[PDB]
Design a protein around this ligand. Structure first.
Ligand SMILES: CNC(=O)c1cc(C(=O)NC2CC2)cn([C@H](C)c2ccccc2)c1=O
Length: 111
């Protein structure tokens, strides 16, 4: 009728986690460890943390009911990065590059 659109989403997720994009994807692999990185304001600024490992667990557990819900979580992850980090930080440049990969492939969703 995973749905056909959620299989496309799963394909995108596999690509975002692949060695192809690892040079700029790695900050998004796991939840931000705020205490480890000394980001003691992170959880005051970011109310809904998101990362690719959480998206993968949700996909594996069939949590997403459609492609829109999946895309909202991936975009939440990028938005958190843009909200917390200064716009000239290396992690924001990496977010922009990984979001470009995401948005162009998400746009190729089969109807
Ligand atoms: C989603 N990831 C983050 O928001 C994030 C923030 C900060 C961070 O220190 N943010 C401070 C507000 C500047 C550092 N990193 C890692 C450790 C990093 C360090 C150097 C280059 C690229 C990435 C993140 O992944």
């Amino acid at each position: 009728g995973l749905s056909e659109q959620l299989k496309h989403c799963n394909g995108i997720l596999k690509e975002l986690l692949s060695k192809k994009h690892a040079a700029y994807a790695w900050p998004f692999y796991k939840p931000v460890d705020a205490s480890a990185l000394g980001l003691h304001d992170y959880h005051d600024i970011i109310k809904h943390p998101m990362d690719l490992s959480t998206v993968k667990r949700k996909m594996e557990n069939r949590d997403y009911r459609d492609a829109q819900e999946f895309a909202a979580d991936v975009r939440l992850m990028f938005s958190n990065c843009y909200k917390y980090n200064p716009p000239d930080h290396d992690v924001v440049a990496m977010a922009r590059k990984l979001q470009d990969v995401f948005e162009f492939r998400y746009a190729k969703m089969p109807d």
